[PDB]
Amino acid sequence: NRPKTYFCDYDGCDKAFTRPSILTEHQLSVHQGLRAFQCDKCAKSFVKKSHLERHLYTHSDTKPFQCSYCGKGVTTRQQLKRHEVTHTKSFICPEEGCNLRFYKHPQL
DNA sequence: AGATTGCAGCACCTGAGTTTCGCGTATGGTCACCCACTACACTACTCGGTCAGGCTCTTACCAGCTTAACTACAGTTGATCGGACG
Ligand SMILES: [Zn+2]
Ligand SMILES: [Zn+2]
Ligand SMILES: [Zn+2]
Ligand SMILES: [Zn+2]
């Protein structure tokens, strides 16, 4: 919506941003080499609250997305969708007019 | 010097210029969520080479003979070869 009208000034940086706090998040993270959210359970650190929140689940068994078929736990919707698509007849015969459909790619 | 009258002084209701304000309307700004793309390391089924098993084909025969060619003996002549020349 609103136009990108805050330009990073550093040598060899191309980026422009919508609102000045975001330009500052970029500058402190990329160019100065500082981060604002530390893991309690390992050495790593993160640039956003949502990124530390994802990393915190990785230290735990009670992972926040749970499979509808097998009940395996995962941390975000992309992982869930890819995993659940393995519980489907995903693959299709690529050859002309052939009707068949398959569950594991080596079968196809 | 009184009957007629104006000045103008008192008080209280009122009006605008000026101000402060509330909202619309709309605009830049915070920040929280969750999505897309990327990617190092991984999961797992198939293909592929190799091997055995054991069923399978096809050979060619023994000494002799009897149909078939070689395989040695044998003689004057080549032209690379040694090793020395230019
Ligand atoms: Zn930059
Ligand atoms: Zn950690
Ligand atoms: Zn599952
Ligand atoms: Zn097919």
Cβ of A53: how many Cβ atoms within 10 Å?
13
Nearest to A29 by CA among A6, A11, A45: A45
- Experimentally, the structure was elucidated by cryo-EM
* Ligand 2 geometric centre to CA of A73 (Å): 18
Total count of residues recorded for chain A: 108
Q: What is the DSSP string of A32-94?
A: I---SEE-SSSS-EESSHHHHHHHHHTT-SS-SEE-SSS--EESSHHHHHHHHHHTS--EE--
Q: How far is the CA of A28 from the C1' of B54 (A)?
A: 78
What are the φ and ψ backbone dihedral angles of A50, each rounded to 5 degrees?
Answer: -60, -30
Cβ of A65: how many Cβ atoms within 10 Å?
18
Give yes or no for CB of A88 within 7 Å of strand B: no
Resolution in A: 3.8
* Ligand 1 geometric centre to CA of A48 (Å): 17
CA distance linking residue A8 with residue A29, whole number of Å: 12
